[PDB]
Amino acid sequence: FVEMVDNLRGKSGQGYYVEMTVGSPPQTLNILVDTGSSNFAVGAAPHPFLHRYYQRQLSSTYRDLRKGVYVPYTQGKWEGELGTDLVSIPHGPNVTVRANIAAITESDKFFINGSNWEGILGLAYAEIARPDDSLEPFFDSLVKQTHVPNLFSLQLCGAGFPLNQSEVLASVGGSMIIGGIDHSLYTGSLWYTPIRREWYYEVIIVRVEINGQDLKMDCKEYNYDKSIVDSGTTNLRLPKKVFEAAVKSIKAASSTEKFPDGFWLGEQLVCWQAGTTPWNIFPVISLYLMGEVTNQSFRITILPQQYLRPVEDVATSQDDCYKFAISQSSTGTVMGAVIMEGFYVVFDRARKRIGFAVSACHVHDEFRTAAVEGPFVTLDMEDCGY
Ligand SMILES: CC(=O)N[C@]1(CC(C)C)CCN([C@@H](CCc2ccccc2)C(=O)N[C@@H](Cc2cc(F)cc(F)c2)[C@H](O)[C@H]2Cc3ccccc3CN2)C1=O
């Protein structure tokens, strides 16, 4: 899986894209990696933030299916024209697949300026595919048409510092291994949590700690509505009654310093002199996830280094600045790209399970470290579901 290593680029706050070609002859695009939708869609008409876009008029294997499609995201939404065409991944499995492709004709707050991607690959399951589950998502088509196993995995890799458009193009930014696990991406063992159900990648969260302290809530409040792993999500999104309790902790604990109220709502940045950021006053966070054995479970611990998100200075100087990358949700938890940045993540479609290991890629400091640890024998698991 050497040929596959390092095939991502991008960062938490603008997305992790990978290169695909579509069409005959093949046309190149960077596609956003999004495990938290299921449409494969590419931009098709001119767009200020688009430096290239899919051109059907130009590909002899294109197939139009005379059907519209509207995809609303939580914020942002596009409109499109369903069709099919030949697809490949240059730095991925050595195959050509025919796949449903929405041609985006109209866009609102979807695309991201300087993000350097032009489509999105919904890596989730058919049930949530728009217009309807009859639209075979890209990975499904990938597996039915060839010999790639029914698993893919994501190592997403944040810098620990803000990166400019030059540098992100230039950075190696992560790996998508389509159809395999690769040993050089993580340390430790993989611990698996079951996928509850094949729509999103919905997991069950069992317990939450802040610097070892149990947030002490009703189980199901944590997974209220749903709990998903979403690489197409910038932050750790938490249900309001969980958010508020969580933020009360990190506030309690990081008490030695005083932060604007707006840093906590996620909007305003905070800065410290070059290299003097006090990671030490901030708590780590533990997500407890149900295990594959009945009434057994494990844990993922993430540092301020994953949840304080590096952003450029308020005038580009040598200060080190950040946004608080945990925010409110009224749709369940969303284990987003800053959390995912801490682990090697295996989407074992075949075994209905999701893999976690300490990423050979995460940002630590010499005193603490991201962890995947278990087993734990906490009770009351079997009805944390919603
Ligand atoms: C705001 C931010 O900083 N970053 C992004 C990520 C950018 C960096 C790539 C931008 C949008 N956004 C959230 C909304 C969060 C938010 C929340 C409140 C306010 C503002 C932002 C989001 O909708 N993500 C979708 C992917 C995506 C990428 C993209 F570029 C454009 C786009 F429209 C969509 C998922 O597929 C999603 C859909 C979904 C749909 C239904 C149920 C669950 C889920 C759960 N998963 C991020 O997290």
Side-chain angles (χ1 to χ4, degrees):
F1 302 133
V2 215
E3 78 263 17
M4 225 113 61
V5 176
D6 276 11
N7 61 358
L8 289 172
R9 275 180 288 171
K11 80 214 153 190
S12 101
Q14 295 201 322
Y16 292 86
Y17 61 84
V18 59
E19 168 138 28
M20 304 156 69
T21 55
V22 332
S24 286
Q27 354 190 328
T28 274
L29 331 78
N30 311 324
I31 310 314
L32 174 94
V33 166
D34 191 350
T35 55
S37 66
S38 312
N39 295 72
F40 182 52
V42 304
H47 191 293
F49 300 130
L50 291 181
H51 279 154
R52 86 184 142 216
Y53 54 79
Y54 177 46
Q55 295 174 91
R56 319 163 261 169
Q57 61 260 15
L58 254 64
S59 155
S60 62
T61 38
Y62 175 66
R63 280 170 184 183
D64 167 49
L65 300 169
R66 297 173 312 106
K67 207 190 313 179
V69 51
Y70 170 56
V71 168
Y73 295 110
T74 304
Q75 144 144 237
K77 44 182 88 219
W78 53 263
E79 170 167 313
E81 289 194 333
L82 295 180
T84 84
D85 205 345
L86 297 196
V87 203
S88 307
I89 309 161
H91 318 282
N94 175 23
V95 303
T96 316
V97 55
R98 181 178 287 281
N100 287 318
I101 311 195
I104 286 169
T105 62
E106 294 266 324
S107 277
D108 187 73
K109 269 164 191 71
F110 175 58
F111 282 98
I112 294 162
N113 188 44
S115 80
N116 192 49
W117 55 261
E118 303 94 41
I120 176 170
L121 185 96
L123 257 189
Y125 282 94
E127 268 221 75
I128 46 163
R130 320 199 162 257
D132 94 272
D133 89 298
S134 68
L135 201 67
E136 180 156 290
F138 170 84
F139 210 88
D140 290 76
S141 322
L142 168 58
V143 200
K144 277 177 191 311
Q145 309 180 23
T146 47
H147 288 315
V148 177
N150 198 7
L151 72 71
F152 80 83
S153 53
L154 280 179
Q155 170 188 263
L156 293 160
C157 290
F161 40 99
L163 322 89
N164 52 233
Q165 229 169 123
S166 204
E167 273 151 339
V168 19
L169 255 30
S171 281
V172 39
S175 302
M176 210 212 227
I177 306 314
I178 303 90
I181 284 189
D182 184 317
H183 301 330
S184 73
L185 290 190
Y186 67 101
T187 38
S189 281
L190 283 149
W191 279 80
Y192 291 79
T193 193
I195 296 163
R196 225 209 159 158
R197 177 203 150 182
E198 268 145 338
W199 59 321
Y200 302 102
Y201 295 101
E202 193 190 346
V203 278
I204 282 317
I205 306 169
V206 164
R207 154 176 189 97
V208 155
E209 282 145 19
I210 303 310
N211 255 23
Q213 180 163 186
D214 169 35
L215 223 88
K216 260 212 108 175
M217 275 161 87
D218 200 344
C219 219
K220 310 172 194 184
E221 281 257 15
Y222 288 148
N223 277 88
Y224 185 35
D225 201 50
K226 45 169 187 305
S227 280
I228 69 159
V229 205
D230 194 337
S231 83
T233 308
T234 266
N235 294 355
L236 175 33
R237 299 201 75 250
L238 288 174
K240 170 180 162 105
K241 281 140 63 339
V242 195
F243 178 73
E244 270 152 5
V247 78
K248 166 129 190 176
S249 279
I250 302 190
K251 256 174 261 158
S254 63
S255 207
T256 67
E257 285 208 3
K258 306 263 173 218
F259 305 120
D261 287 335
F263 157 88
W264 298 117
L265 202 58
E267 328 274 80
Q268 66 181 111
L269 64 52
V270 171
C271 303
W272 288 274
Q273 270 203 220
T276 59
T277 286
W279 308 108
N280 100 81
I281 83 180
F282 293 107
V284 308
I285 286 143
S286 311
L287 290 193
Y288 275 76
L289 307 152
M290 150 146 108
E292 275 216 303
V293 169
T294 312
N295 213 56
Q296 167 194 305
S297 81
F298 66 97
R299 93 164 155 213
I300 79 185
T301 320
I302 52 123
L303 318 183
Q305 279 95 341
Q306 290 65 61
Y307 74 78
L308 296 202
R309 186 173 51 90
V311 200
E312 206 86 75
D313 188 340
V314 131
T316 298
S317 162
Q318 283 129 0
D319 277 32
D320 290 351
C321 308
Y322 299 95
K323 268 135 159 183
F324 181 67
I326 302 150
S327 87
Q328 255 186 83
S329 140
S330 0
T331 65
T333 322
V334 184
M335 301 163 50
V338 297
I339 314 312
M340 277 195 69
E341 256 169 16
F343 324 80
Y344 182 22
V345 184
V346 180
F347 291 75
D348 186 341
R349 292 170 67 99
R351 278 117 148 179
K352 210 150 176 217
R353 59 193 179 145
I354 293 149
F356 303 87
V358 167
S359 150
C361 207
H362 84 273
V363 183
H364 55 307
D365 58 40
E366 45 279 290
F367 304 117
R368 312 202 288 203
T369 212
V372 169
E373 292 189 351
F376 292 91
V377 183
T378 83
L379 310 312
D380 66 65
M381 268 184 241
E382 273 291 356
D383 103 335
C384 300
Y386 197 67

